[PDB]
Amino acid sequence: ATRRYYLGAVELSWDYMVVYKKTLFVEFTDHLFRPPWMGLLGPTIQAEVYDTVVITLKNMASHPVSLHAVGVSYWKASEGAEYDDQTSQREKEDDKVFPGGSHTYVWQVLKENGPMASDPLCLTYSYLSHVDLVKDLNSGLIGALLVCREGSLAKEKTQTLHKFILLFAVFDEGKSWWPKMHTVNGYVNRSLPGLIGCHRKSVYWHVIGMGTTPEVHSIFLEGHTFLVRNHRQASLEISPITFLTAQTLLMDLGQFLLFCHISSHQHDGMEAYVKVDSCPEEPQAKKHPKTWVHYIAAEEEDWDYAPLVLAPDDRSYKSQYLNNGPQRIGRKYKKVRFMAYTDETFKTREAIQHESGILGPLLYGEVGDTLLIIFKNQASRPYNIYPHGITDVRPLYSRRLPKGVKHLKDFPILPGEIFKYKWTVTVEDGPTKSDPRCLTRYYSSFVNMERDLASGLIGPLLICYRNVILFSVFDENRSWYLTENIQRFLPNPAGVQLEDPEFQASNIMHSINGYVFDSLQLSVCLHEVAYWYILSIGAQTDFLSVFFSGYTFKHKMVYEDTLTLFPFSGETVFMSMENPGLWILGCHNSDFRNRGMTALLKVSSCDKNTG
């Protein structure tokens, strides 16, 4: 036999080392009576191209569980599907197996089934059961299947074992059989072992998304940048059901954490720890960087998302947002932004452009360049200044930490003070050969991670080998200056609806770069090529962002994508855009009420000014 496997279907219980019972995939030598990190997964089966496998699943279950293949070739024998395929019996036989029934599957690694060679060695697919998908998969009906370039496994003895299978799974335990789950390979709260890798050696992630509902995730690794498409991802955006082969460089040592970052997801699970140790050893001018300087500060001011036509009362869609009424505080709220401030210590650099609203100073990083954020918290509550994207961030003058605390972002939060920061850029942090240059980044105030941001503190960091559009949602309600806002604009002095649906979301504006329904207009002259660094923040759910003008517009991430871009939220990527378009531009929040509630903006087609 080229290669063969024996699967079971055994019903075992599960504690996510809460107790739950599940009917999952099992393997043996040939009937009878693993490695922990794998945990839940039905065993990862893998074949070189040309060589072809056979399972013989035994349904040692209550459930009649079938075996679908998602990425090889069959004959209506291999697939586990019953559908009106007019093939009849013996050929639907394994196209869904019976309880107690031990029936046999065949499949092939066709020369065409194989990776492209622009592709990574071993393309991650998986398997499952095509017999009530929701009633199935939940309870453990998912394994990992991988096909690889021909002279393939032979290398594995030579090759890296750094082949870890990451199963990101939202098991709605309460199907096939009370509330949900969010596991990573079948663990919840930072549970689970394995996940060790070598120090200067890199690790590869065989990633599997798992849904059974429109459920979405965005999963990072504590201070670590992902490589997937050969474009640095930094995010591992992960759709309802995806297959992804990613890699991680693994510089430095110790315990860092991968984890789903969203809203309620962490309160459900989806975070787990990845150790790196040191490993056993076995040998058988015209150029260069300069460093950036930024005298910057967090000062406070009121923000007005205005002004255009005010359409009162009956405009119970429009006005409700930005009209001062008996229980509403439109347009203007008190915020805190970053300013590069003009008149103060370590002089300055300050002039504002209307075109980026709240958005902070733009901070530019060329690989190997350093940054010098001489930051001061100019106003009120103590706030922090940390850049998502770079890595070597320690106060200049010392690798020491304020004695008191861990990772500066965590704490020393400077309430009336001034702190001097250094953002050294490595090539690691920077764009690859493949990704377009100047990948988009942002920086916030990690006084926690979210709470302040909403208040109004945010700006754009470019990393490179400058029109910026940040979509964002400003909650206002979680904003620090709510007390100061309620008691400045609302008609009754203090006493009023403590909280309510009516006003809650009536004080969550949909930004457009912290600008509202129509703003900006923007100043681009025809035929000027731009680079459009755009990003979502604020509240989450995917994004759908597009340009809709006198040329609608099309842009290129590599191959040109159209009336579409999709920032994952709390996330960002950037865009080249030839401008031979034309004037007046719907600029897309694009999605749902998101569209009705806050999107618009515009574009131009001026010409004839030169320098």
């Binding site: 056979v54 998602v70 990425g71 070739s73 069959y74 209506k76 024998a77 697939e79 599907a81 559908y83 009106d84 395929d85 007019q86 093939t87 009849s88 019996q89 065949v106 066709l110 065409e112 194989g114 060679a117 622009s118 592709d119 697919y125 009530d132 998908l133 849904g211 059974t212 429109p214 759709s239 309802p240 059901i241 995806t242 297959f243 759910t541 995917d542 759908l544 597009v546 809709f548 003008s549 006198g550 609608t552 290129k556 590599v558 191959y559 040109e560 994508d561 159209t562 009336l563 579409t564 999709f566 031979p580 378009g581 034309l582 004037w583 007046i584 531009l585 999605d591 749902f592 087609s605």
Partner: protein
């Protein structure tokens, strides 16, 4: 250079079923000569697959899309895409100045299909942008329309004739259909008998090109022929639809060549992929989101083999006489007469001058690559059919005028121009119906025909293996016992259909109710059926009338066929001369096969072929 399309928004009714019937009034896109209404709004055959989708507006790099547009519904709409581009302007404005079209109003959009609207050196001979109606980005779109635009590089899509053709194109578009947020009372109020929980899920279709559950139609595939797929996806945030091509994988380009077996449509994204279905048959393509599947969003592409072709036996036995039907024929030249059947006076069907229809019940739905037409002489005067169209259906409810390739309203076929014409007309792309009708258009002083349509079965099976074609070894064939005498040697090896020679048949040494003839296929095989025969040798005629079939995957163990419980008696061949054929309804599949005569006339004797298709070796 340049291309124009004549396109318009219609309001029409949408249904599914095949399981109270839900009838919905959504608004879609159609294309016609420019005659506004009564004529001409026609498209069909291969393009079924779009369904709700507006038609393929295909252009090249460089050239122009001109797109005339006519709204015919209550609330004004607009043809817009990403590329509705150059609008140079002159103190007149641009974007809101041609924004929308009122009902009955009529506008033409026309732009230069720039490079920035194109496929790159990074491959795929075509891209796949999308057209919507703006005005309401969500409302109208949900209710009514969506269109697939595709631009390709230079000498790419065929002159005058259609578009592309090197390769087959398909735009499967995936979405959730909420309704209610789309169209109002005329939609909402109909079937009245109440806002979100109660039946809200019921209005929501999860539908490929607007066909919930397995309803989607047009998936003529064709084994081993590059197929480009267009996956443009749309709707709200729920639809991240993770489409999967059942046990097929495809490639995509985007600065490189990536292989993958499912790709996710972020609403708005579209995309293009190429794959070649190595194995033919029916297969699924679905979003693999569990919830989203059992709510619909699954369809079957129904790929055929090219090397499948065979007569369905209008000449031979398999076709029985009851199968046919006619307008009613003047003269006794009744149908039941078609192809090569020259007997005495009567050899064909033949009506008088008024327009007619010879329809054929295939008794099952089936694929058909082409028909062979006939005419006959009587009284010197030459009788034939000169020109005709084919109609086809599955249930006898639906009917369809077949177009295939032919530019315009349909393809008319060219019949014979004489008695004994033999015109193999060809149906690529091919028909799928159980029911083929035939309407004549031209004739010579009368209408009249013999015919024998040729196709292959819905699966790509039903084909002869070795035996007659001699491809199976007379080393491979064995039998229980045989009649060997000096000279004459009725060897098992001679059991091959339509073979003429010394000792041209099989014969068991002397007769037994239970004997056997066997065939060492070698490979493990599927068997559609068996064509059976009989031989006359020197004025004595002999044939096998009743028979029983064994099969084994086991050299020494055998399992008799059993039908409807009981083991079954096979009826065929009342004569030596002719061969007749047995269906084998649930097809036994084995490496080795055996056959036992029961009622054998005069003497036992057999020639035969087997029918079938290859299944995996070593299992």
């Amino acid at each position: 250079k340049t291309r124009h399309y004549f396109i318009a928004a219609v309001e029409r009714l949408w249904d599914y079923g095949m399981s109270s019937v839900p009838q919905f009034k959504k608004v879609v896109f159609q294309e016609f000569t420019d005659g506004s209404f009564t004529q001409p709004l026609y498209r069909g055959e291969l393009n079924e697959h779009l369904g709700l989708l507006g038609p393929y507006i295909r252009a090249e790099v460089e050239d122009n899309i001109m797109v005339t547009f006519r709204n015919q519904a209550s609330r004004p709409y607009s043809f817009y895409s990403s590329l509705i581009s150059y609008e140079e302007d002159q103190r007149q404005g641009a974007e809101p100045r041609k924004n929308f079209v009122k009902p009955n109003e009529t506008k033409t959009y026309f732009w230069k299909v720039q490079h920035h609207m194109a496929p790159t050196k990074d491959e795929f001979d075509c891209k796949a942008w999308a057209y919507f109606s703006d005005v309401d980005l969500e409302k109208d779109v949900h209710s009514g329309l969506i269109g697939p635009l595709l631009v390709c590089h230079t000498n790419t899509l065929n002159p005058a004739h259609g578009r592309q053709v090197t390769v087959q194109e398909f735009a499967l578009f995936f979405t959730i259909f909420d309704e209610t947020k789309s169209w109002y009372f005329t939609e909402n109020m109909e079937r009245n008998c109440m806002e979100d929980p109660t039946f809200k899920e019921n209005y929501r279709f999860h539908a490929i090109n607007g066909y919930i559950m397995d309803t989607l139609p047009g998936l003529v595939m064709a084994q081993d022929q590059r197929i480009r797929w267009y996956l443009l996806s749309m709707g709200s945030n729920e639809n991240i639809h993770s489409i999967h091509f059942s046990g097929h994988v495809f490639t995509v380009r985007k600065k490189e060549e990536y292989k993958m077996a499912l790709y996710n449509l972020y609403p708005g994204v579209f995309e293009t992929v190429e794959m070649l279905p190595s194995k033919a048959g029916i297969w699924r393509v679905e979003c693999l989101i569990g919830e989203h599947l059992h709510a619909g969003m699954s369809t079957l592409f129904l790929v055929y083999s090219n090397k499948c072709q065979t007569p369905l036996g209008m000449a031979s036995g398999h076709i029985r006489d009851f199968q046919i039907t006619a307008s009613g024929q003047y003269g006794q030249w009744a149908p039941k007469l078609a192809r090569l059947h020259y007997s005495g006076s009567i050899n064909a069907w033949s009506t008088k001058e008024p327009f007619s229809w010879i329809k054929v019940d295939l008794l099952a739905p089936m694929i058909i690559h082409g028909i062979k037409t006939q005419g006959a002489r009587q009284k010197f005067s030459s009788l034939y059919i000169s020109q005709f169209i084919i109609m086809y259906s599955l249930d006898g409810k639906k009917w369809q005028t077949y177009r295939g390739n032919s530019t315009g309203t349909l393809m008319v076929f060219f019949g014979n121009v004489d008695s004994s014409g033999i015109k193999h007309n060809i149906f690529n792309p091919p028909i799928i119906a159980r029911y083929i009708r035939l309407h004549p258009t031209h004739y010579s002083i009368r209408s009249t025909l013999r015919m024998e349509l040729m196709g292959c079965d819905l699966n790509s099976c039903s084909m002869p293996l070795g035996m007659e074609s001699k491809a199976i070894s007379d080393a491979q064939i064995t039998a229980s016992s045989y009649f060997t005498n000096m000279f004459a040697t009725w060897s098992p090896s001679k059991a091959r259909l339509h073979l003429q020679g010394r000792s041209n048949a099989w014969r068991p040494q002397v007769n037994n109710p239970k004997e056997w003839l066997q065939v060492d296929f070698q490979k493990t095989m599927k068997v559609t059926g068996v064509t059976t025969q009989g031989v006359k040798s020197l004025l004595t005629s002999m044939y096998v009338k009743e028979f029983l079939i064994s099969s084994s995957q086991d050299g020494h163990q055998w399992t008799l066929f059993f039908q409807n419980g009981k083991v079954k008696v096979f009826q065929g061949n009342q004569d030596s001369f002719t061969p007749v054929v047995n269906s084998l309804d649930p097809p036994l599949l084995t490496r080795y096969l055996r056959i036992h005569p029961q009622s054998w006339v005069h003497q036992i004797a057999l020639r035969m072929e087997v029918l079938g298709c290859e299944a995996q070796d070593l299992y």
